[PDB]
Amino acid sequence: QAAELFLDTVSTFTSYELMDYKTFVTYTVYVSMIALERPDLREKVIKGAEILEVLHSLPAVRQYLFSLYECRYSVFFQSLAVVEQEMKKDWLFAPHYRYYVREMRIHAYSQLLESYRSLTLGYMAEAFGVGVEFIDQELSRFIAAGRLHCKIDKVNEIVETNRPDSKNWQYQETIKKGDLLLNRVQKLSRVINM
Amino acid sequence: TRPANHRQLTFEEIAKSAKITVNEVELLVMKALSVGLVKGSIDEVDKRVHMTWVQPRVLDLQQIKGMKDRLEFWCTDVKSMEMLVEHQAHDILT
Amino acid sequence: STQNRRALDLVAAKCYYYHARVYEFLDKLDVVRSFLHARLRTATLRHDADGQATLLNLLLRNYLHYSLYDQAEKLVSKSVFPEQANNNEWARYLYYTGRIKAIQLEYSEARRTMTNALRKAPQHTAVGFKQTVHKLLIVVELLLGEIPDRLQFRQPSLKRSLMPYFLLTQAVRTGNLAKFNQVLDQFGEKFQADGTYTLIIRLRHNVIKTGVRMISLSYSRISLADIAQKLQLDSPEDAEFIVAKAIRDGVIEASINHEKGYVQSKEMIDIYSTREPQLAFHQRISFCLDI
Amino acid sequence: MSEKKQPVDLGLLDAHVWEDNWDDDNVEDDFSNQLRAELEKHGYKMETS
Amino acid sequence: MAKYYTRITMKRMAQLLDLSVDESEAFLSNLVVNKTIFAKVDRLAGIINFQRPKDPNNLLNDWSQKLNSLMSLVNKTTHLIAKEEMIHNLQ
Amino acid sequence: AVQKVVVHPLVLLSVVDHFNRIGKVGNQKRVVGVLLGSWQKKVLDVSNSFAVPFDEDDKDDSVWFLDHDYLENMYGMFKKVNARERIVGWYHTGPKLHKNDIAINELMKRYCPNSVLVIIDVKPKDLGLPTEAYISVEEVHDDGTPTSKTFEHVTSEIGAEEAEEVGVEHLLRDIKDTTVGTLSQRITNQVHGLKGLNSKLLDIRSYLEKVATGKLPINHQIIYQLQDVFNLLPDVSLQEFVKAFYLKTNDQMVVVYLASLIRSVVALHNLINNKIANRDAEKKEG
Amino acid sequence: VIDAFRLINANMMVLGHEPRQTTSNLGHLNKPSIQALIHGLNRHYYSITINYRKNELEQKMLLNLHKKSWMEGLTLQDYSEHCKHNESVVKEMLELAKNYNKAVEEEDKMTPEQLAIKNVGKQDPKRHLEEHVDVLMTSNIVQCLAAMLDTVVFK
Amino acid sequence: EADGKTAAAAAEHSQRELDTVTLEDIKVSGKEPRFVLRAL
Amino acid sequence: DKKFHGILDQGEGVLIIFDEPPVDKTYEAALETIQNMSKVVDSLYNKAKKLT
């Protein structure tokens, strides 16, 4: 909802609570970079010139945005570390300064693991940030969490995409929601009719 | 000759049975198709062909006993299948 | 028989309950159980409704108050009569059979039946046995190789009571025996007071089982020169054995190439093409028409 | 109707008003207490090699 | 050959056309981009694959068609039977 | 030429009346008559008919009598009271073809160059349909047998008119019908299908006996056709066809599940209305 | 609508004689209409009862008069187009469910007949919801059954 | 209604007994003397 | 950018191309009719549970 409401940036009077209109801009770009997917990020906050004009005075944030958009992951983490440290020592964002990181990382992975279907891991050794076993353990701990669906093999050091399909899933949620409603109607018939 | 379950066959079999070298056989079968006496398709990457229909031919007074044999126990299958649905749904309308 | 309809329709049904409670309140239970057996027997002949529900629950109750055999009765019991129930008694009957199933080393199918038990309780404020059934459900699901659910731990009605269980699972997930001992030696009095200490006294082995299960779900093709290395297991010979047992009872689907030294797991997909969804749907069709 | 009479009993009786809307239990569990300095997690890893 | 064959290798094509493989590819390329020939060459193993669209709803369309033809044919045989038996066994 | 023929009920009742009446003039087992009709776009419509004297000495072909200048006279007398309709063909009520009717047809064809034959069998002994349609053609042969003059089959049906179906329905007070919806489907399109298919296969079965020296193989033609039949019939239900079948069965049943669920909820709702209404009014009227 | 008549006598009826004899209930089963009374049926003539007496053979015909050939019964409908019809009706169900929720919410809020009387324009979603069942059913059942049969009876 | 009428519809009386049980649990010396004084 | 659809492989540099399957119907539609009448059942109680 925060990124849904900060779309204005064109009627934000020079309000007192955000003394700097620039702070308002930085906040709205921060939330928008996480709430929404590639189609709109490519349509609205990148093809609108008021924000672009503002960013023109803000090298850091502009670089941080373009890094993600143009897939130069080498500098993406360079920027994300700095934005993280800026996140920690700020009010109304510090309580979960960690959470943000744990999100963006995962999202960046889903950025790249979609184009390929059999990417080798050594490719991320140099192209994404150094350290092989580092990528190893982050991928391992992220996969089990039910997100970033794929599958790795250490013997030949390879990754398989493991695409799911629009029918098994579109069948599973059907069956579970049906069971839930059916339980509901059973109980609700039970209390009535003695 | 071959039973309808298969009617699929490899280059080598024809090549020997008609004693013509293998590299000719393609053109042979293409000729067969083009004159319109047999229908199907060819699957050259593994050297196989499939032949789904063939010109009828006359046959003798003992071969037709095979026809009568097949047809009889095909026929009984229909009556068997009718008994079931005429029975189990008796109450909807007999 | 003459007024059996009314006499046993109620009044008697609740009477048995209260009369039993008295005895439990400040007395023994034994000749009560003999009387209950006799009274169940005189039912099931003239009548077959609610005389076979309240008595069954009470009788199994007092059997479980002690720690007897407790199973040879269910098999021939004929089950709590369906077709009629107050849907309330079904709940505790399921809870009882769930417990007596869990203590006899039958884990996998205990969770489903006791969850079915829980979903039948009302919306009422009482958290008397909801706390109990939740507590048992958490502890059986720490067996196998799962995670209980990171919810049903914060809800206002129940939180103080589940505190030690959260503090336990917070240890079990990381899988560090140190902290697990530091929890047990700290709250053992509480646990044995709960009447569920023995279940959790065997938990360490299922700890290692949960670790290897998550590993199985992570990778597909992996050498044994790492399974034990990253599980702190020093020997790679017994890793073969623990993995093989995990395969035997169905924890993971992989096979082992003993000479080669790699473990690979097979992938089976396309469940839509099989006949089973038709079955799952036919059952529900039948139920809806029944309603 | 909703009798809920129960031999089983209530049993028992905060500094936690930080409700982060929902959940985070798995999330907080993921980074339970370690791997903290993510800035340092990168930085002191790029100098490593 | 696309009318007759189903799947065919590279070298057999080059041999039947009496020209280099590269020229075969270049020649059929503008053909396929012209929406004139329905072919899907796979270079790695070089197996051209004409007329291989495939469908999971067409299959039993074909099945139902064969059923209709069979019923009609069995219908038509009996008229022939009757009129021919008429000219031999009337008396 | 003709692609299909349509018959109105008035013709069928006329046929039956003639068949019952003849007993006052002879003892024959067949009757013959004329069809008045019209047609357009190769769809032929028969509407009315009258019957003309005919007779045949049963024990031989080639000895039969058919009265021209009664036919011409009646056709004149009818034309004077309806100009719409013209000679089209003829009908007879025998259960089976006869040797000489090609020689009847070559007569009456002088009144209409396209003439069509309709067999209207008046005593059915099966489930079936009461009419068949035939047209005359010349056949070449591959055996060098001389050119043969022979009948050919044409598809047929019953039609209707709004001024008649009122009468038909006023008269159809005889038995049950219209077991609505799902009741009528399975009867009308499973059971009464299978019974027909079975009768056809029994007929082929019987014919292939006579070829046990009882009769000469009528042609290799009929054998070629049979070989096509047993070749065409669907492939063994054994390959990946099975996968394609399961997919549709799942999809066919899923929506059934949905609809059944809807069906139950409404019953509950109606239940509640009945309950409250009852108790309230009861306490009120007490 | 058929009637059959015959003239009353050419009077000499001032005698008050009845036109006919009666020795049965059999003639007084029917009520004469107002119109014929206007034009005077019992004043100048009398009606006679029509009766039908079909024989065996014509009534045997009359039932065949609608039978349809075996060729059709075993035939399948196309599976495409059929799926199209299924998706059409399922997407038509939505709007009716949405409307049904409100129609449940608002009832008993006013006097009882003033439900119907105020529902003569806009449709009532119960019936339109219900009668889209008996279209998913019937259709899907019979198609699946017919396919399931003929998969056996041919090879 | 339970015995005057066909002895199957004491279900309403059953629910009445449930209600009275719950209420009396949360509900007396004078009620008991009166109650007891019913003669019938 | 999903303008042209297919897939990519890193192992040996091969651009596999295939025709994307449809996204279905009479499933997507059902998956929310269920939701809609679940809400209907919830709203049934404002004059079912309370009034009784």
Reduce the secondary structure of F235-271 to three states and give it as a string: CCCCCCHHHHHHHHHHHHHHHHHHHHHHHHHHHHHHH
Q: How many Å from the N-terminal Cα to the C-terminal Cα in chain G?
A: 56
Cα(A185)–Cα(F262) distance, integer angstroms = 12
The amino acid that residue F167 corresponds to is G
Residues of chain A contacting residue I46, judged by C-beta atoms under 8 Å apart: none
Pairing type for strands E7-8 and G45-47 reads: unpaired
Angle between helices F192-210 and E58-86 (to 10 degrees): 50
| Contacts A–C by Cβ distance under 8 A | 45
Asked if C214 contacts C145 with a C-beta cutoff of 8 angstroms, the reply is yes
Q: Tokens 């099966």, residue?
A: F126
Full residue range of the structural domain in which residue F261 is found: 223-282
- Residue B58 DSSP class: -
| Contacts B–F by Cβ distance under 8 A | 58
D18, D39, D44, D49: which to substitute to probe chain A, counting the most A Cβ within 10 Å? D39
Cα(A7)–Cα(F216) distance, integer angstroms = 93
Q: Is C83 left (phi over 0), alpha (psi -120 to 50) or beta?
A: left
For residue C81, which of C122, C117, C52 has the smallest C-alpha distance? Answer: C52
Same domain, F145 and F230: no
Instruction: Give, in order, the Cα–Cα distances in Å from D25 to each of D30, F18, F165.
Output: 8, 94, 77
Asked if E1 contacts E14 with a C-beta cutoff of 8 angstroms, the reply is no
Q: Is C127 exposed, middle or buried (0-12, 13-18, 19+ CB in 10 A)?
A: buried
Same domain, F8 and F126: yes
Cα(C131)–Cα(A13) distance, integer angstroms = 53
Residues of chain F contacting residue G91, judged by C-beta atoms under 8 Å apart: none
Task: Give yes or no for B41 touching E (CB within 8 A).
Answer: yes
- Cβ of F197 within 8 Å of Cβ of G68? The answer is no
- Residue C119 DSSP class: T
Alpha carbon B25 to its chain's center: 22
Instruction: Enter the tokens of residue E84.
Output: 């021919």
Answer whether residue F215 is part of any domain.
no
For residue A158, which of B70, G83, C219, F188 has the smallest C-alpha distance? Answer: C219
Instruction: Enter the tokens of residue B63.
Output: 């071969």
Same domain, F174 and F257: no
Same domain, C220 and C270: no
- C-alpha atoms less than 13 angstroms from C-alpha of I40 in its C-beta half-sphere: 23
Cα(F153)–Cα(F134) distance, integer angstroms = 5
Answer whether residue F37 is part of any domain.
yes
Q: How many Å from the N-terminal Cα to the C-terminal Cα in chain B?
A: 47
Task: Give yes or no for G141 touching I (CB within 8 A).
Answer: no
Nominal resolution (angstroms) = 3.8
Q: Is A123 left (phi over 0), alpha (psi -120 to 50) or beta?
A: alpha
Cα(E57)–Cα(A51) distance, integer angstroms = 51
- Residue D21 DSSP class: S
Cα(A62)–Cα(F226) distance, integer angstroms = 81
Instruction: Enter the tokens of residue A190.
Output: 């039970």
Instruction: Enter the tokens of residue F218.
Output: 């009528």
Cα(F277)–Cα(G6) distance, integer angstroms = 60
Same domain, F11 and F101: yes
Length, in residues, of chain H: 40
Answer whether residue F194 is part of any domain.
no
For residue E39, which of E61, E8, E12 has the smallest C-alpha distance? Answer: E8
Cα(E53)–Cα(B86) distance, integer angstroms = 42
Cα(A181)–Cα(C291) distance, integer angstroms = 14
Name the CA radius of gyration of chain G, rounded: 31
F243, F257, F268: which to substitute to probe chain A, counting the most A Cβ within 10 Å? F268
Question: Which run of H or of E encompasses A2?
Answer: helix A2-5
Same domain, F175 and F228: no
Asked if E77 contacts F226 with a C-beta cutoff of 8 angstroms, the reply is yes
| Residue ranges in chain C assigned as alpha helix (H) | 4-9, 12-26, 30-42, 54-65, 88-102, 108-118, 128-142, 163-174, 177-194, 197-200, 203-218, 224-227, 238-248, 276-290
Pairing type for strands F131-139 and F148-154 reads: antiparallel
Sign of CA pseudo-dihedral B35, B41, B44, B49: negative
Task: Give yes or no for A10 touching H (CB within 8 A).
Answer: no
Pairing type for strands C262-264 and E7-8 reads: unpaired
- Residue I8 DSSP class: B
Same domain, F169 and F115: yes
Tell me which residues of chain H have a C-beta less than 8 Å from any C-beta of chain A: 11-12, 14-15
Q: Tokens 């023994």, residue?
A: C28
- Greatest alpha-carbon pair distance for chain H in Å reads 36
| Contacts C–D by Cβ distance under 8 A | 40
For residue A46, which of A14, A69, A30 has the smallest C-alpha distance? Answer: A69
Pairing type for strands A151-153 and C219-223 reads: parallel
Q: Rounded to a whole number, what is the distance in Å from the CA of C288 to chain F's nearest CA?
A: 6
Chain breaks in chain H (C to N over 2.5 A) after: 27
Q: Is A112 left (phi over 0), alpha (psi -120 to 50) or beta?
A: alpha
Q: Which chains touch H (3 or more CB pairs under 8 A)?
A: A, C, D
Instruction: Give, in order, the Cα–Cα distances in Å from C112 to each of C79, C106, C247, C283, G79.
Output: 17, 12, 22, 18, 40
Cα(G70)–Cα(B85) distance, integer angstroms = 17
Report helix, strand or coil for G51: coil
For residue C190, which of A175, A77, D12, E38 has the smallest C-alpha distance? Answer: D12
The amino acid that residue F236 corresponds to is V
- Cβ of D4 within 8 Å of Cβ of C128? The answer is yes
Helix-, strand-, coil-residue percentages of chain D, each rounded to 5 = 30, 0, 70
Cα(A132)–Cα(G96) distance, integer angstroms = 57
- Residue F9 DSSP class: H
Q: Is G26 exposed, middle or buried (0-12, 13-18, 19+ CB in 10 A)?
A: exposed
- Cβ of F218 within 8 Å of Cβ of E85? The answer is yes
Backbone angles phi, psi at A116, to 5 degrees: -85, 175
Q: How many CB atoms lie within 10 A of CB C111?
A: 18
Give the strand order in the sheet containing F116-120: F148-154, F131-139, F116-120, F86-92, F32-40, F43-51, F4-7, F156-158
Q: Tokens 């790679």, residue?
A: C236
Torsion of CA H8, H12, H14, H16, to 10 degrees: -160
Instruction: Enter the tokens of residue E36.
Output: 């004139």
Report helix, strand or coil for F87: strand
Answer whether residue F213 is part of any domain.
no
For residue I26, which of G88, C270, C274 has the smallest C-alpha distance? Answer: G88
Alpha carbon B87 to its chain's center: 35
**Facing residues of F7 across strands?**
F46, F158
The amino acid that residue A71 corresponds to is C
Cα(I33)–Cα(I39) distance, integer angstroms = 10
Which one of E6, E12, E47 has the shortest CB-CB distance to B41? E6
- Cβ of B78 within 8 Å of Cβ of F236? The answer is no
Angle between helices C54-65 and C12-26 (to 10 degrees): 10
For residue E41, which of E53, E29, E30 has the smallest C-alpha distance? Answer: E29
Which one of F255, F262, F268 has the shortest CB-CB distance to I26? F255
Same domain, F81 and F168: yes
Instruction: Enter the tokens of residue A118.
Output: 């059999």
Cα(C240)–Cα(C246) distance, integer angstroms = 10
Q: Which chains touch C (3 or more CB pairs under 8 A)?
A: A, D, F, H
Same domain, C110 and C214: yes
Same domain, C175 and C115: yes
Considering its fold, how many domains does chain F have in total?
2
Q: Tokens 């205990």, residue?
A: C110
Same domain, F119 and F55: yes
Instruction: Enter the tokens of residue H9.
Output: 């519809």
- Helices then strands, each counted (H, E), chain F: 8, 10
E6, E62, E71: which to substitute to probe chain B, counting the most B Cβ within 10 Å? E6
Full residue range of the structural domain in which residue C186 is found: 95-224
